[PDB]
Amino acid sequence: CKGEVNFKRSKFVKVPSNVAPSMLFELLLTEWHLPAPNLVVSLVGEERLFAMKSWLRDVLRKGLVKAAQSTGAWILTSAVGLARHVGQAVRDHSLAVRVVAIGMASLILHRQLLDGTPIHYPADLCPLDSNLSHFILVEPGNDGLAELQLSLEKHISQQRTSSIQIPVLCLLVNGDPSTLERMSRAVEQAAPWLILAGSGGIADVLAALVGQPHLLVPQVTEKQFREKFPSECFSWEAIVHWTELLQNIAAHPHLLTVYDFEQLDTVILKALVKACKSHSRDAQDYLDELKLAVAWDRVDIAKSEIFNGDVEWKSCDLEEVMTDALVSNKPDFVRLFVDSGADMAEFLTYGRLQQLYHSVSPKSLLFELLERKH
Secondary structure (H helix, E strand, C coil), X not given: XXXXXECCCCEEEECCCCCCHHHHHHHHHHHCCCCCCCCEEEECCCCCCCCCCHHHHXXXXXXXXXXXXXXXXXXXXXXXXXXXXXXXXHHHHHCCCCCEECCCCCCCCCHHHHXXXXXXXXXXXXXXXXXXCEEEECCCXXXXXXXXXXXXXXXXXXXXXXXXXXXXXXXXXXXXXXXXXXXXXXXXXXXXXXXXXXXXXXXXXXXXXXXXXXXXXXXXXXXXXXXXXXXXXCXXXXXXXXXXXXXXXXXXXXXXXXXXXXXXXXXXXXXXXXXXXXXXXXXXXXXXXXXXXXXXXXXXXXXXXXXXXXXXXXXXXXXXXXXXXXXCCCHHHHHXXXXXXXXXXXXXXXXXXXXXXXCCCCCCHHHHHHHHHC
16 A cells, blocks of 8 residues: 655555565556666664674765666665664765665554654654655564565566566675574575674674584574673574574575675675576576676676686677677777677677667767768
8 A cells, every 4th residue: 555754755655564576566666767676785684782883884885875876776774873874874875877775664653643744753663764765664473574575575586577687685784583584584585695794793603604514503503692792591492493594594505605894896796696606507697697797897707707607608698798888888898708709700780780870879979960961
């Protein structure tokens, strides 16, 4: 149900859990008039118990703002400390391709007043700021929100729906003991994970949970839970359940990687290309990664991960992305493609020349000459 809030018109859709996420995604793409999704990034951890370095958070936010103009992404943070500051900075920079923030929450103070239009909430309890310029609300236990978020993130990572497709990234910041089950709801969801180190405790210890391969260790799991901020003790049954859940997590470990940012787009690209490699060795998701790189112009990672790999290249995918990169004024790429197998002795036919001449910014003097001539 479409709900309105006027408190930049920050508006939302109130769609409960256990409801078709494909319909929600399509009505969001059609209603908000939001440009075609290229990539999407999600922020899952919202635990204000651990505060990453303010300088670290500001640097990461600045890097994300820089990458937003080139790539074009969606923020899917959940509606404090360093997380709230990073979100506010990202929103303030988005207010000035374009990136949008999307908050997810179930059925918040003044809930009855909002469920009934100038919204008044002058308080000093789920406060929402101007960060959610376009939001989503759910009115379904936390299992409803978990399944809803997971299935939405799965659908936004659909196929072509020109092989058009987008990447999803879930970011944990020192997580939560139930965010671990939420991560179990995503390991089989065919979506990659990226974890930081200087964010907090649970992040730093997850950096070694799956990093150090041990068959079974519930005792060591509880020792880690009690070493990293022992705010509350746990029994053996819950720790054993979480250990079995870790065993399920480690079934597809390639989708997760750690990084200490206290010591940018490069790690996102590396994680995503590892995902496309471990998923399978095909030219198609390779083409996905290629297109992303060309949108980013990370020639180093492009040559190393995609082409330097043992995959054999050919004319078709290299051809499509060559037409994509030629017009895009990135010559280094064109070189990388022609020495990799692009045969412009037979690629470029008169048709492609007409198509290249048609793709000029009408503010170019060549276009003025062509217009006057015709």
